Amino acid sequence: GMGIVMSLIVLAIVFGNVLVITAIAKFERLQTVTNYFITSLACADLVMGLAVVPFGAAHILTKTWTFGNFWCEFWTSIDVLCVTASIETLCVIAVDRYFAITSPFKYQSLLTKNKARVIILMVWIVSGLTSFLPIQMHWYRATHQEAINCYAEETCCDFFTNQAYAIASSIVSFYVPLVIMVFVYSRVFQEAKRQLQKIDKSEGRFHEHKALKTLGIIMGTFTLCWLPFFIVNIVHVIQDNLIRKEVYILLNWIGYVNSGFNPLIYCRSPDFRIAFQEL
Amino acid sequence: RNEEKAQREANKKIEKQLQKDKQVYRATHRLLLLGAGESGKSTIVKQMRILIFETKFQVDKVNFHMFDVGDERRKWIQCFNDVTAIIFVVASSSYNMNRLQEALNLFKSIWNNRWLRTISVILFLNKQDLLAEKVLAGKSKIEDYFPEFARYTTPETPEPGEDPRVTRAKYFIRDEFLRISTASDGRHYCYPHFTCAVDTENIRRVFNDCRDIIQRMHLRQYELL
Amino acid sequence: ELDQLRQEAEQLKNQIRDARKACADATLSQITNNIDPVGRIQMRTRRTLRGHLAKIYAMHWGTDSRLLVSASQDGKLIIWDSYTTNKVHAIPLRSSWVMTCAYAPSGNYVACGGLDNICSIYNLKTVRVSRELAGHTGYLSCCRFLDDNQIVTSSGDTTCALWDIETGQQTTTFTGHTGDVMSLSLAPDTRLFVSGACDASAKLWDVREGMCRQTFTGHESDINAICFFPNGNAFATGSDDATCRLFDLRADQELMTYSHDNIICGITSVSFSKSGRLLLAGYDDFNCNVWDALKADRAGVLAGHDNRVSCLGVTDDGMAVATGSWDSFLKIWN
Amino acid sequence: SIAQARKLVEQLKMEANIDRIKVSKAAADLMAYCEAHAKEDPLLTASENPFR
Ligand SMILES: Nc1nc2c(ncn2[C@@H]2O[C@H](COP(=O)(O)OP(=O)(O)OP(=O)(O)O)[C@@H](O)[C@H]2O)c(=O)[nH]1
Ligand SMILES: CN[C@@H]1CCc2c(ccc(O)c2O)[C@H]1O
8 A cells, every 4th residue: 555655756756866967067068066956955855765764664664673773863863863964055056146136246256166065065074063962972861751662672773852852853853044045045035026017117118926936936846845844853752642643654655755756846947957858 | 218207297287377367367258349440439548548459447446347349341250159249339419521321321230140040239339529519500401311201200318408300310410329129039139328439438348248148148047037 | 334344244155055955965863863872871970069158150071080279159179080979178268259260281270260350260289379460451251271371261351361360461352252252162172263242243363363264153042151062063052042053164064953842041061071971061950851862752850959150161071060059069970 | 244144154165175084983983092092091901000
């Protein structure tokens, strides 16, 4: 039943990402300063899809972890790293678009092929600092009886966390890269609306939903995918016996679905269409 | 064996020089000045000289470079498919000496060129005062030379002190170019202007438009316009 | 009296057509019908040259089949080394627009000209400007080194002239074309040369005499490139109608046409092989094609460029062929 | 331009008077040359490739 759906999801996640990665390498024209962020995101999403989704699906199917505690701790760390790194890349892309649109005469100077690698390395290090250091070490460990009881057992390892980590990780991962997106897209929309008015006055005697459609798609997919999870994350830690575990798992898995939509949104250029047809 | 080492060192020096020159090549913007005869491009350039014949000028720490066009058919125009913009200069007051019809034909030919599909055009309508002098208390009329002027009405930003007649003539002349610009894409547009040769504000007119052209290209790149 | 004189010329123009048609004994296709085809030809790139900042307009292979030169709108001439894919020189240009380049037979001088009406000559082994040639009233299109002391060039003012490097003054001026002159080629003995004008006509000139000899008008559109047969009695031209025609000096008339129904793009470069059996031609379809000289049968496609091809050349020893494209990339095929 | 016409008239007469042969001989000569020099075309037909 659900195994077919999991297999289809895994195939969809893997195929689009590998196709996008292969295309950028195959064609010199496709490669660009702004395409380094896209391929970094594709690599992170491919790692996530090939690491966390299959093991999580197997665990939820068989309902019993058959590996060691260290392996599942590493699995949790990898999941946190990939989830954290899959959003700050989008934020960086939004900032790059803002700089390209609102600063036309200084875009070449501000962004250089050497600076893109530095930014990518910095964001990856930041993502990995909050996903391996606090989890390989036991700073995130809880205190109640159920948590330690499951920790002692070698057959179960569920996500039990304390307030400090549950707040810090959420703030670093989701809430911070959201206001930047909102402000950037508001400024871009204002600039686009201003440019359209000038054309109408000059050519009005002879003769704006596209921006709304594009911005709505871009913001709505991410917000709908990742909004409820990062709210219930804080909610069930502030107060217990309020959010069921099944609801938490379902929301987290819904958040995973956003993997298969990034290629369909950020790779819609005609050049990408020409590249994909050749391969 | 030392020949390979010497060649590698020379190659490294050459690549270092090329990397140094890449930034200065990318920073500058290139413009093409193209105007009909007797239009008055010499007055516009040298007066703006304060700052093929080449000129380099800087506006707000931005490097601009402009090339003039030192006959009946142009085959050298293929090399100018990567310029930022094209400046067109025409004499507005020469409607009876026809030269204006030839200018319209030249503009139509330039607009529909194969290699200039994505190149915008900045229009400078020169000799504004001579046109006003001709139209005021002038025996010559646009009606005889241009029959379409009979059925033209004023379009509802006039400067103070100018009779309705000068406004009608100027806007009719501008519309004759805007019609050709508009019907044939949204990939490139036209920017009409009214400029006396002595005008000291013309230099800022280019910088403001180049910025608009770049911004519109970037907006259309990301599918937002 | 002009009208009557023009009518007499028309009668003379007719007198020729009849003489040309009288000698058409048999078409070249009929003569060569049983010749075995050369078969499918596959070519793969061997080297890729990077370092040019803008589109490439011209190139010229060296006489040693090792070095080559290229020109770009960045205002820089780079002398390459095919064997070790490393650069040797980088010569900045006073003018940022260039349309041609050349390499001396002795390997000591390199010349280039462009939109400015100046031909500049550089001394490789001394890199600074050695001489500047002025006098043309139109943009240059091509220039070939006739020797180490004199250069022949063609400009856009419907004239061709022969210069002297030592003096700097024109020696002989060739006139007769109506449209712009776009390309030219030299015979192996450096005694005669041909040029292709924009008025759909190619003429044969005499360097020593300075007077035109023959005229061919088979084409109906602009002529962009021309090559010359290794034997020394034939040449081929490329026009904007996707057609290549092989003329003949002695018969005075066309011998074959190369065209296909699936191409409507122009031709920018034409070159022969060492044996003359293959006719390599460039197109605006972002690739290249290989024809057959004696059968007019396509036998290969040379693709791999993302933009139009504007340069083409074959080494003297016939070991490789190089193409130049507007994508600022050079490639070596073999 | 009466002179331009005069220059054109003289050139044609010089072009008109020349010695010409049948196209069959030229075609045979070209075919013979191509056949004779067909054994020394590396592009057409592997002792070494300098590029190797
Ligand atoms: N009143 C008035 N006179 C002008 C204007 N523009 C040019 N003139 C005059 O007309 C002359 C002709 O223009 P020039 O600057 O000499 O240039 P040109 O003769 O058009 O030559 P090109 O620039 O090569 O086309 C100028 O020298 C001025 O004396 C203008 O806008 N108003
Ligand atoms: C095992 N699933 C984890 C659990 C908690 C968590 C996730 C993602 C980002 C965070 O900041 C988190 O705190 C989820 O992917």
